[PDB]
Amino acid sequence: MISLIAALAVDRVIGMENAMPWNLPADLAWFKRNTLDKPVIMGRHTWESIGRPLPGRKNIILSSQPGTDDRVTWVKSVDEAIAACGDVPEIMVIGGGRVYEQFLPKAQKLYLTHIDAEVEGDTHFPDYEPDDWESVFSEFHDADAQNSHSYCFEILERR
Ligand SMILES: NC(=O)c1ccc[n+]([C@@H]2O[C@H](COP(=O)([O-])OP(=O)(O)OC[C@H]3O[C@@H](n4cnc5c(N)ncnc54)[C@H](OP(=O)(O)O)[C@@H]3O)[C@@H](O)[C@H]2O)c1
């Protein structure tokens, strides 16, 4: 199946100027945890921000244009992207905006990081219907020495 994985600040804010407007090492770990040994579909935008494959995962990028790193796989359509995954149990969609927007409808689950920070962004997470999903997990964390904001992990499934 298909899964989305994002970290949202206040107001679904997900990025600014091609970046994540905060720094939460703790999130990094949860992300790795959740994407380890899975294929990951990402947008060219996001790809450019990462700048190198994610070990432990099949990296599939979406671009109209042609590939620019032989180490990762390129694609020109949502169905091909999906194709490229193969017969895997969970495909992970890692953003950016436009991509979330697209796979959203197709998703059966989301993995969220709710971060208590109010920041301006140029990208926000697709609006979804609270009714359609069922929160099956939550895990609160207070700000800390390294994580300057408290945040909460959560997991929803399509109702
Ligand atoms: N907060 C988080 O959880 C999280 C996770 C990821 C990213 N982000 C943030 O996301 C922001 C950028 O997201 P974005 O929406 O600007 O870009 P994106 O989705 O990362 O990149 C979009 C690009 O992907 C290509 N694309 C998308 N759908 C396609 C399709 N069906 N076929 C072909 N190409 C397709 C297009 O590239 P072409 O130019 O090649 O057509 C498009 O310009 C950044 O700020 C990043 O930091 C946040």
Swiss-Prot record:
**Effect upon mutating M16 to F/S:** Increases catalytic rate about 2-fold
Result of changing M20L: Increases catalytic rate 2.5-fold. Increases catalytic rate about 7-fold
Keyword NADP part of the UniProt annotation: yes
Q: What's its EC?
A: 1.5.1.3
The residues that hold substrate are I5, D27, R52, R57, T113
Q: Which InterPro entries match?
A: DHFR, DHFR-like_dom_sf, DHFR_CS, DHFR_dom
The annotated pathway is: Cofactor biosynthesis; tetrahydrofolate biosynthesis; 5,6,7,8-tetrahydrofolate from 7,8-dihydrofolate: step 1/1
A single Gene Ontology CC term: cytosol
What positions does the entry give for NADP(+) binding? Answer: 7, 13-19, 45-46, 63-64, 76, 95-102
Q: Which reaction does it catalyse?
A: (6S)-5,6,7,8-tetrahydrofolate + NADP(+) = 7,8-dihydrofolate + NADPH + H(+)
Q: Name one Pfam family in it.
A: DHFR_1
Q: What keywords does the record list, in alphabetical order?
A: Antibiotic resistance, Methotrexate resistance, NADP, One-carbon metabolism, Oxidoreductase, Trimethoprim resistance
Q: Which GO terms describe its molecular function?
A: dihydrofolate reductase activity; dihydrofolic acid binding; folic acid binding; methotrexate binding; NADP binding; NADP+ binding; NADPH binding
Which superkingdom heads the taxonomic lineage of this protein's source? Bacteria
Q: What is the effect of changing L28R?
A: In strain: B[RT500] isozyme 2
Q: Which leading EC class covers this enzyme?
A: oxidoreductase
Query: What's an example GO BP annotation here?
Result: response to antibiotic
All residue ranges annotated as the DHFR domain in the record: 1-158
Family matches, as NCBIfam families: PRK10769.1
Which PANTHER family does the record cross-reference, listed alphabetically?
Answer: DIHYDROFOLATE REDUCTASE
Note on file?
Answer: The strain K12 sequence is shown. Strain B [RT500] is resistant to 500 micrograms per milliliter of trimethoprim.
Q: Which family does it belong to?
A: Belongs to the dihydrofolate reductase family.
Its function, per the record, reads: Key enzyme in folate metabolism. Catalyzes an essential reaction for de novo glycine and purine synthesis, and for DNA precursor synthesis.
Q: What is this protein called?
A: Dihydrofolate reductase
Which organism's genome codes for this protein? Escherichia coli (strain K12)
